[PDB]
Amino acid sequence: WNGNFVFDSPISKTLLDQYATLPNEFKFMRYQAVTCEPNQLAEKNFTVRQLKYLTPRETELMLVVTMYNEDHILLGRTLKGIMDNVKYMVKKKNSSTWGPDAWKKIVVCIISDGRSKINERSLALLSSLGCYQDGFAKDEINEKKVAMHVYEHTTMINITNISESEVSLECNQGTVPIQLLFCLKEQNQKKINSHRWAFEGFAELLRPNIVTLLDAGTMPGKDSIYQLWREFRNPNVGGACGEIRTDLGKRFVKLLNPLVASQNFEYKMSNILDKTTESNFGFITVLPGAFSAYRFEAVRGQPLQKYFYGEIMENEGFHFFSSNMYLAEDRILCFEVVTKKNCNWILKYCRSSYASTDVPERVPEFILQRRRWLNGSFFASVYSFCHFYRVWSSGHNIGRKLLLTVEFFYLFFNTLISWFSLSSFFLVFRILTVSIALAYHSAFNVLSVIFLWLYGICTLSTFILSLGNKPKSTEKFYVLTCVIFAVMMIYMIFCSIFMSVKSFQNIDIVISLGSTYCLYLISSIIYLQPWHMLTSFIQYILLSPSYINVLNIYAFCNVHDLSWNPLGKINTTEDGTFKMEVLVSSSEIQANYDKYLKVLNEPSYDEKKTGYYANVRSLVIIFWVITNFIIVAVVLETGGIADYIAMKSISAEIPLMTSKASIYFNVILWLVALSALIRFIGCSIYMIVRFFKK
């Protein structure tokens, strides 16, 4: 058909039996062998059923779900969320867009990447829905490798219950049809290629209004997708995101794990403070698991082009934003949408839309997950700060350009703070432990020495294992390191409290620690989600030194993933002379000798790119360590500086502590207080504006 392989094989008699409990699209399942590039779907005469009926279907919302090639449970969770949202949107009464036939304006796209990696349970479930069936998959046509397989069905069944082991599929008068579209790549290309298929491929044929990106295992709420869609009423909005919640399992059983409570508090703090503060200015960065939506006309053009391919202008050699730009290629979309030329798109954060995802529960996978977040956030901030002049070439008004400039400066200020945390934590810890020892003398001298040595044995080992080993290989040591750092944090808290109490008895750390805690709590109260402030808060404080001295070290030590004529067969069962008298010459005997006597008379692009990536990774690490030690040696007078000053004075001996320690200790808490104040003000403005608009 039209030069492409197609097939319409009716779904199982069983499925068809319940579907009737009939128009044409419910009854056949269509297959399509896509053998072109994603950016060629329209010109290759490839189409989708939405475009073939008597009246073509104008789609309003395209839900792209990236199959995790994982257990059906996660995918079933995502699909159940989507079907619940669609049912809500078809039961809506007073609405111009959604109605009893909105099931026709929504398309679900499941871009599975591993044709072999895909879990059998997923295909088994997808088959139950009727959007897949085995048997007709041509791995080669016209002597050309088919790039992916497209199966299209409109199933009338919905998942209504998902226990710990089963998904309940039923077909009643209350179920709604859903337009599935199962894409299935055949070879392991990364997530950016899945997005390339979603955006440059099927979105070019369907022409949606909004394009929503989901993952496998992310459950949207009963009402989340509709609330995210409502954000695009304002014609200026070019993107949006929602809240991310850690799901705690049956009656919050997972809170007993101390690595899940930490992430619960971290997620809810992030959503309450950072997302609202950024959304006030107008530029936000979708969280890794946060469900996102992009108005199609907004991302179309330059944003997509530099998200997929990167900076085109590049010679044969490599460049920081021409060979390393991909590091922030994702957040590039947000950076490119906001700063589009002659266009005033803004990014908005929706709090009425949430999605509950599952968080890692062991330290190895936690470290491996955060390795991609930290590198992405660091490179994205560097790039956005370096290219802030683009804000003044866009189409915004003067006030919105000024606001965006201020936000970019503040974001780079936060990045600069996070870069020096390695030295800041050690400086605070050492100054505090030596000050209390020097003031009270009781047993804190030996504790100071012991804790200095414990930190050094855990920092050195973390560097070495992150540079050479893998987290899965050594999990017990990482658990031990986290426990040791938690004990050090307990001791630091004890020193601060104890000296503050004694100073109160005798008559700033107490002043700030209370201010930032109260700002946190007041923001939580205003956001109307205050239970995290006590339920899962302590574990965040104890596993906070391990977020500054383990996740950062591994993230920086693993910036890029660097992966560095036969003939002659004789076998005669009867020992027969197959060659016999043949292949027997006297002139050839001289030919080989003459030829042999006559003889006696940079590697590929991959290794070059790998070398460049390794050099970048080892230059970043070295600069990080050197600058942090520069700060430490300037403050504590380590590195032989105190020796040098003593020698100049002789031209004496080293004192125990100086006023530089006090000055630095005050500066750090002032910075912390300023950051907390800024984020509190941002959250307050967000809630006030939202309330007035509502």
Ligand X SMILES: CCCCCCCC/C=C\CCCCCCCC(=O)O[C@@H](COC(=O)CCCCCCCCCCCCCCC)COP(=O)([O-])OCC[N+](C)(C)C
Ligand Y SMILES: CC(=O)N[C@H]1[C@@H](OP(=O)(O)OP(=O)(O)OC[C@H]2O[C@@H](n3ccc(=O)[nH]c3=O)[C@H](O)[C@@H]2O)O[C@H](CO)[C@@H](O)[C@@H]1O
Pick out residues in 450-509 that bind ligand X (CB under 6 A).
Answer: 452-453, 456-457, 459-460, 463
| Contact track, a second copy, 142-181, x by CB under 8 A | xx-----------------------x--------------
Contact between 174 and ligand X per CB under 6 A: no
Contact indicator for 111, 151 with CB cutoff of 8 Å: no
Contact between 420 and ligand X per CB under 6 A: no
At 33, which helix (H) or strand (E)? Answer: strand 28-34
Q: Give whichever of 95 and 188 is closer to ligand Y, judged by the CB atom.
A: 188
DSSP 485-519: HHHHHHHHHHHHHHHHHHHHHH--HHHHHHHHHHH
> 55: exposed, middle or buried (C-beta count within 10 Å: 0-12, 13-18, 19+)?
exposed
Q: Give whichever of 32 and 218 is closer to Mg ion, judged by the CB atom.
A: 218
Which residue in the set 92, 190, 222, 341 belongs to the binding site for ligand Y (CB under 6 A)? 190
Binds 253: which of ligand Y, ligand X, Mg ion, none (CB < 5-8 Å by kind) = none
> 406: exposed, middle or buried (C-beta count within 10 Å: 0-12, 13-18, 19+)?
exposed
By CB under 8 A, what part of segment 1-60 binds a second copy?
5, 9-15
**CA–CA distance, 470 with 564 (Å, rounded to integer):** 16
| Contact track, ligand X, 637-656, x by CB under 6 A | xxxx-xx----------x--
Contact between 336 and ligand Y per CB under 6 A: no
**CA–CA distance, 293 with 367 (Å, rounded to integer):** 28
Give the residue among 128, 80, 136 at the shortest CA–CA distance from 108. Answer: 80
Contact between 138 and a second copy per CB under 8 A: yes
Which stretch in 183-191, 253-261, 599-607, 622-630 sits in contact with ligand X by CB under 6 A?
622-630
Give the residue among 131, 138, 112 at the shortest CA–CA distance from 33. Answer: 138
Residues that bind Mg ion (CB under 5 A): 217
Shortest separation between residue 551's beta carbon and ligand X, angstroms: 15
**What spatial distance separates the first Cα and last Cα of the chain, rounded to whole Å?**
53
Shortest separation between residue 202's beta carbon and ligand Y, angstroms: 17
Q: How many residues bind a second copy (CB under 8 A)?
A: 94
Contact indicator for 632, 638 with CB cutoff of 8 Å: yes
298: Cβ–Cβ under 8 A, 6 or more apart, which residues? 238, 239, 337, 340, 343, 345
Q: Give whichever of 539 and 558 is closer to ligand Y, judged by the CB atom.
A: 558
Task: With H, G, I as helix, E, B as strand and everything else as coil, classify residue 76.
Answer: helix
Residue with smallest beta-carbon separation from Mg ion: 217
CB atoms within 10 A of CB 261: 24
At 325, which helix (H) or strand (E)? Answer: none
Residue with smallest beta-carbon separation from ligand Y: 68
3-state secondary structure 221-277: CCCHHHHHHHHHHCCCEEEEEEEEEECCCHHHHHHHCHHHHHHHHHHHHHHHHHHHH
Binds 569: which of a second copy, ligand Y, Mg ion, none (CB < 5-8 Å by kind) = a second copy
Which residue in the set 158, 423, 549, 558 belongs to the binding site for ligand X (CB under 6 A)? 423
Which stretch in 21-29, 363-371, 431-439, 517-525 sits in contact with ligand Y by CB under 6 A?
363-371
Which residue in the set 410, 477, 612, 629 belongs to the binding site for ligand X (CB under 6 A)? 629
Contact between 244 and ligand Y per CB under 6 A: no
| Amino acid code (one letter) for 424 | S
Contact between 216 and ligand Y per CB under 6 A: yes
**CA–CA distance, 348 with 237 (Å, rounded to integer):** 7
Record the tokens describing residue 587, joined without a space: 């002139």
| Contact track, ligand Y, 21-60, x by CB under 6 A | ----------------------------------------
DSSP 384-419: HHHTGGGGGGBS--HHHHHHHHHHHHHHHHHHHHHH
| Amino acid code (one letter) for 485 | F
Q: Give whichever of 112 and 280 is closer to ligand Y, judged by the CB atom.
A: 112
Contact between 663 and ligand X per CB under 6 A: no
583: Cβ–Cβ under 8 A, 6 or more apart, which residues? none
Q: Give whichever of 48 and 79 is closer to Mg ion, judged by the CB atom.
A: 79
**CA–CA distance, 495 with 437 (Å, rounded to integer):** 10
Shortest separation between residue 422's beta carbon and ligand X, angstroms: 5
Binds 135: which of ligand Y, Mg ion, a second copy, none (CB < 5-8 Å by kind) = a second copy
| Amino acid code (one letter) for 589 | I
| Contact track, a second copy, 462-501, x by CB under 8 A | --xx-xxxx--xx---------------------------
**CA–CA distance, 295 with 231 (Å, rounded to integer):** 10
Shortest separation between residue 439's beta carbon and ligand X, angstroms: 16
Residues contributing to the site for ligand Y (CB under 6 A): 66-68, 113, 190-191, 215-216, 288, 360, 365, 368-369, 372
Residues contributing to the site for ligand X (CB under 6 A): 422-423, 426, 430, 452-453, 456-457, 459-460, 463, 625-626, 628-629, 632, 636-640, 642-643, 654
